[PDB]
Design a protein around this ligand. Structure first.
Ligand SMILES: C[C@@H]1CCO[C@H]2Cn3cc(C(=O)NCc4ccc(F)cc4F)c(=O)c(O)c3C(=O)N12
Ligand SMILES: [Mg+2]
Ligand SMILES: [Mg+2]
Lengths: 40, 264, 52, 25, 270, 40, 194, 142
DNA sequence: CGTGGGCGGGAAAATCTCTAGCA
DNA sequence: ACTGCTAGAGATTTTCCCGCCCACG
DNA sequence: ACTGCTAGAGATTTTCCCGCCCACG
């Protein structure tokens, strides 16, 4: 990662790393927004 | 981007909103929003003395058995623990448990004999916790602590038929007060408020820890159509094509080829 | 609290805040957007001409 | 109207007009 | 130093904090943070992360005693080829192992034995036998069974094939001989697809044919190479040429097996 | 491997894979002629 | 001989107080004249002796020119330890080579200048053949020109140490803790970078 | 800079004339206070430059005391070939630690010791007193 | 006499890999 | 209908910085 | 002065063959 979230459901999550469109299941996902956002 | 700073400045002159509103609305870096809220005159409120470490302590004796109740008073979160014997070791053990779960910064209590043990002093010395005795931080929630204790006694009067032992019904009661009590502005039961307060405190203290090293640094800079190296200005945002600084009172942008950053 | 590292240099006490914060933010934003945006996509699939 | 926040960043007037538009129908 | 460094030291006295935590919480360079991590002696890590190398030389042979069905089994392995012998032991003692090693030395060109620090492998009888046969004795780290891990894996494999071969025989030793025959001949694969019996024949034949032939070569060819080394103008020599290259030759001056380019070299017939 | 041999002693053997000079010690060498030499 | 041993003593020319000093490794005269029996001029001379080379100690006699609070305050401010022969020879051979320049000069301190240079640079002999001002450089500047280990003993989880290295191996290291010559593998031990 | 070459300069402070001498290849100063600005005192300054430390020549300014007949006779039987920023760093360090100084000379002494052994740096955290002996070591060992 | 840019030397930071131990 | 995983140490690649000096204004 | 190692299974990449068919002689 870190990929960009596109759509969230309940069993799967659509993300985009650079140009691929990955459908990652819910038991494999990690979604967070860092406190380090203040620079980037 | 850079032309929204002045219309955030006049916005802070007319309405004096904090750095979060001017940062999220104008899509600014938060450092220039904290400097806009810093450069104001009437927007300079008090310091810390807000706090996520507002914690009230209160003992009670129900069914001839000690229940020690802690309240996270900043969010209204409350929990308790059944204590077998009144001594300072039990209070120090429960305080170290509370410090292990949540970042307890300051505790408010009375001058009770059990809460004045030197074991609790050694525990808070090993923890680094400011302590208050009998002094309310603000007198609004002072009655609300007692009213929440009476509310939890009403929940005990609900759920005493839900469990055999005292502490099992106590855990069911604090589960109910954590989840089965709704209302408020956006339907938060008890945990969403405290995780919002803790997340905002963590983010603003990360911003404090980020900005506390930048103010030591110096940026000597020249301008375009200029070789006069002015400064040393104060860095706001280091960029790849444009660096944001402030020399005296103006938020300026500079090319990196015109910049020179002292490392200390 | 004291042990830092892992994913983004935080302790586990910060990640357990951030995970539940994203939990009670993102799906509520999704519930707020799913009642507004409702677009119906008809698609002509591969190797075929049927607009499904 | 100058103070916002919450899940969607709502004010009080837009929230109460949304709940009144819900309550009418 | 700074007061934050001293308070990070107090943090290290109370919690033994990470270097990155002290670097983040007090805006420190990582070198002094790793020094403060290395300061207190209670903060000792789990050592290095790299495995050693076991010798692959034809003159070395490993031994081990293993246990199965309440009986002791002597196993011997040639390290370069993987050729295995095994036998049942009457009783675990140094004299019978010395007899087994004398049979091994009488059947095979054995120079070095590398075992663990067991009781039967430290007797005076095997010492007298290895002195009689001129065998270099060597042992390993006293509680590291990984240098003998080749023969440990070969104890695993032979017992696995014994699990396949136990039903054909009434007793242990017949199945042991059948299994070691199966592994030394029928098991094919590895480097060039062969069993270890052809591989040890290849090892000993290549060893003899590539020591006697170079012994006959080195008494005829004798070229003396002088060399002007790099970064310097001194013509140093003479050196013994090992093999003439195309643009760079390989020589030995006194002890260094080195490469010198031919433009920086000068070869003399005698 | 398999590299070509250049000179052999007892302690170390020098070989050449493509252009390198590998002074491999005796404890790491493997001197075998593969008997599928009957084609190459 | 230590790389920082110096020796201070006194001489009275016409009842006039000068302070002589000598490095024990070379026997190297330096000197200063003081106007009166004071301690401020002594600390003056001590840190002017340190003024170009680092000084580790100063050797004195048992007089009261080293038991005062000014010189001890200065030497403990700088960090030089105090402690109260090789000087008594050259202090006798400091009053002899003035005779080439004594009556040949109006001021006698010019004869002191020329005599201390003729002692400094134009005095050689012995094994090395250098001058004394170069002999002290040779001695100290040849004096100007080791890790710990920890280990986990096998069949145990407790880590011990520290110990000193003996010989480096690519799989195991041999070490001495105090007198225990032990060989420990690199997967069970760990060496400090310094 | 050749390791036999040194440099001199003068200054005036609190009514007292002080003189600095440096090694140009290293940069460690040595100052000394004299009562009267006479040629005797600067010839003794040439003594406390030359008689211990490995000098070859001299380097100072156009003062008449620096080129007197006493100085020229001292260079005559001292082999010194008279040819022809060292003060501001000393004037920085004296004012911070003037408080432990009953006289100005002790302040000069503690300031040059701060310059000696309390400011570590270079390539290995060295002093200037090590650098001068390393350069004259290269001279005596080449 | 007054400036610019690549280089190199060094720091330093992100990732690769690899292992110890959980009985 | 279920599932190996995670903290630390060199090691190696990737990248700013600085000073400097040789090439240029 | 000493040192983890080796046999087997998908899995994945790399590479002849054949037939064939579409492009050409
Ligand atoms: C009495 C229950 C009933 C069920 O069986 C036993 C036995 N057991 C064995 C281990 C153990 O061997 N851990 C080390 C380990 C080794 C290899 C690996 F891949 C993973 C690993 F965790 C445990 O940790 C554990 O909790 C139990 C346990 O609880 N029980
Ligand atoms: Mg064994
Ligand atoms: Mg075994």
């Amino acid at each position: 990662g870190p990929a960009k979230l596109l759509w969230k459901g309940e069993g799967a999550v659509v993300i985009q790393d650079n140009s691929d469109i990955k459908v990652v299941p819910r038991r494999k996902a990690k979604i967070i927004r860092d406190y380090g956002k203040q620079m980037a | 981007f850079l032309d929204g700073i002045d219309k955030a400045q006049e916005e802070h002159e007319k309405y004096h909103s904090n750095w979060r509103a001017m940062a999220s609305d104008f899509n600014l870096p938060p450092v220039v929003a904290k400097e806009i809220v810093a450069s104001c005159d009437k927007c300079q409120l008090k310091g810390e003395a807000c706090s996520p470490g507002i914690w009230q302590l209160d003992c009670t004796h129900l069914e001839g058995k000690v229940i020690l109740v802690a309240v996270h008073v900043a969010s209204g979160y409350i929990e308790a623990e059944v204590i077998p014997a009144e001594t300072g070791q039990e209070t120090a053990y429960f305080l170290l448990k509370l410090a292990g779960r949540w970042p307890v910064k300051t505790v408010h209590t009375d001058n009770g004999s059990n809460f004045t043990s030197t074991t609790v002093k050694a525990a808070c010395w090993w923890a680094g916790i400011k302590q208050e005795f009998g002094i309310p931080y603000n007198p609004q929630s002072q009655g609300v602590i007692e009213s929440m204790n009476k509310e939890l006694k009403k929940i005990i009067g609900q759920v005493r038929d839900q469990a055999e032992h005292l502490k099992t019904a106590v855990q069911m009661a604090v589960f109910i007060h954590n989840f089965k009590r709704k209302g408020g502005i956006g339907g938060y039961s008890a945990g969403e408020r405290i995780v919002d307060i803790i997340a905002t405190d963590i983010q603003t203290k990360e911003l404090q820890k980020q900005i506390t090293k930048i103010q030591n640094f110096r940026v000597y800079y020249r301008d375009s159509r200029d070789p006069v190296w002015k400064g040393p200005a104060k860095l706001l945002w280091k960029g790849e094509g444009a660096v944001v600084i402030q020399d005296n009172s103006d938020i300026k942008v500079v090319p990196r080829r015109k910049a020179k950053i002292i490392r200390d």
